């Protein structure tokens, strides 16, 4: 259908794979470093999709610098994912305003 | 069967250098994590260190004197440890477990009795 | 690093009897903690993951509680093939580390 659709799509199917990748690159850059607490793959995921939607828990993050660099990738996947859904829907709204105006 | 096989045994003289070997089997993911840990007699589990051979990324228990390498051949799923320059206090049993990137060792290696003598 | 105290080192309990083992952790760690058991020269084999989650395999008179700082491996009513060393081992932060182990001692 639409672009804003597609994209809408596409980067749901993008951030589900930087959610993943970033779970596993969180543990190989973490282990290894004293203190570190995302060194487990089932919290490493739930602390990528904390990230991704900034819920701000603060119960895990990144104590390294590959790790940090993973974190950036992934908060700003899901920033900007959830913002081209937002840009998507306001698309659809303002298609239909102006059929509504018969125009 | 037996998922893990390591040899039960190696001579090793004073300065001298072994390399402990640890075959794997059964359910093999890119998540596995192959641990090693030392146990001298009476003692208790001592850590040493892990590797991920999908990887090759290896880390290790830095509250003590380096004595190891990791390796690993993802060919034949076999986990090496070098040991080098080994004394009297290296001659321990050294197991080697996998761990599924959890945080526990499902599984261990009947171990490898390391015995530095002349 | 994460210290795992595990004491008393040995405990001599009766035949039958309820045995708790003890295992307290420098920090909070969950329940990111496991327990492992050890026959006389035999391998470490996991009892419990999780601080409380049995595995498969193992007699249900195996249990473990507690979070935190303060974990606990029961057995209800002791028997001969459980004579030997207890291990418990935290994945919380790294490096993983483990308890200097308890020797369970029957007294028949």
């Known amino acids: 259908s639409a672009l804003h659709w597609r994209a809408a799509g596409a980067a749901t199917v993008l951030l589900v794979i930087v959610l993943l990748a970033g779970s596993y690159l969180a543990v190989l850059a973490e282990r290894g470093a004293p203190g570190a607490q995302l060194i487990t793959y089932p919290r490493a995921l739930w602390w990528s999709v904390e990230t991704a939607t900034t819920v701000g828990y603060g119960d895990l993050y990144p104590v390294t610098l590959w790790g940090r660099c993973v974190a950036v990738v992934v908060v700003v996947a899901g920033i900007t994912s959830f913002g081209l859904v937002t840009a998507a829907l306001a698309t659809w709204f303002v298609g239909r305003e102006q059929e509504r105006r018969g125009h | 069967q037996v998922q893990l096989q390591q040899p039960g045994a190696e001579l090793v003289k004073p300065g001298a250098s072994v390399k402990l070997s640890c075959k794997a089997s059964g359910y093999t993911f890119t998540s596995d994590w192959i641990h090693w840990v030392k146990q001298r007699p009476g003692h208790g589990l001592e850590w040493i260190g892990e590797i991920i051979p999908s990887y090759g990324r290896a880390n290790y228990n830095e509250k003590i004197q380096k004595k190891a390498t990791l390796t690993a051949d993802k060919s034949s799923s076999t986990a090496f440890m070098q040991l080098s320059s080994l004394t009297s206090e290296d001659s321990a049993v050294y197991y080697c477990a996998r761990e599924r990137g959890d945080g526990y060792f499902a599984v261990w290696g009947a171990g490898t009795t390391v015995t530095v003598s002349s | 690093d994460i210290l795992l105290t595990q004491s008393p080192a040995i405990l001599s309990v009766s035949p039958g009897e309820r045995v708790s083992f003890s295992c307290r952790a420098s920090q909070s760690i969950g329940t990111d903690i496991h327990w492992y058991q050890q026959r006389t020269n035999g391998s470490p084999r996991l009892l419990i993951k999780?601080?409380?989650e049995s595995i498969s395999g193992i007699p249900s008179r195996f249990s473990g509680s507690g979070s935190g700082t303060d974990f606990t491996l029961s057995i209800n009513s002791v028997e001969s093939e459980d004579i030997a060393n207890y291990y418990c081992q935290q994945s919380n932060r790294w490096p993983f580390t483990f308890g200097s182990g308890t020797k369970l001692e029957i007294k028949r």
């Open positions: 999780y601080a409380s």
